[PDB]
Write a protein that binds this ligand. Structure first.
Ligand code: HEM
Length: 154
């Protein structure tokens, strides 16, 4: 489903606030993912030793990864749907090396929404959350199509 410019602007105006401190947002989002759906942590050989939220919060390398994740996602969002070039390497690594099912991409989308909702009520009212959800649905739909092309049933 194609987003309107108005919807993209709601997405980008909350992303602008994420970008005040991407590192802290990335910690919150990865931690929320791992707490809400612990099976997702097991996909990270790099991080699955972390036992508690405290350990997660103290991990500089998890923080680093959260910045990488959110910056990659931000670049995708800023393309406003024209994200074919960005999705290719992402889909290929996530299909073939990391083996991340679409269901787990749903889980991180949920975590993103939850953190934005908590942190940014001024820029994440119902319409803005709907726009973000549409953007993440488009991301997951297009990633799923690439997964199929790449041979992964996701
Ligand atoms: C918004 C969705 C996501 C984005 C934008 C994202 C982005 C990235 C980026 C940019 C990398 C580093 C380059 C690469 O290997 O592609 C990465 C690595 C990785 N991703 Fe994701 N990712 C997302 C969701 C997920 C989810 C939900 C999982 C697991 C449940 C996952 C598992 C991994 C793993 C295991 C790595 C390798 C980490 C390491 O050992 O360095 N990703 N991701």
């Amino acid at each position: 489903m194609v987003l309107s410019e108005g919807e993209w602007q709601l997405v980008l105006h909350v992303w602008a606030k994420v970008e005040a401190d991407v590192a802290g947002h990335g910690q919150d989002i990865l931690i929320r993912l791992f707490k809400s759906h612990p099976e997702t942590l097991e996909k990270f050989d790099r991080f699955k030793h972390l036992k508690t939220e405290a350990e997660m919060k103290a991990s500089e390398d998890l923080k680093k990864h959260g910045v990488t994740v959110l910056t990659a996602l931000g670049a995708i969002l800023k393309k406003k749907g024209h994200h074919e070039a960005e999705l290719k390497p992402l889909a290929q690594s996530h299909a073939t090396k990391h083996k991340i099912p679409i269901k787990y991409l749903e889980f991180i989308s949920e975590a993103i929404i939850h953190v934005l909702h908590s942190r940014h009520p001024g820029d994440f009212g119902a319409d803005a959350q709907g726009a973000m959800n549409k953007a993440l649905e488009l991301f997951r739909k297009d990633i799923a199509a690439k997964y199929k092309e790449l041979g992964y049933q996701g």
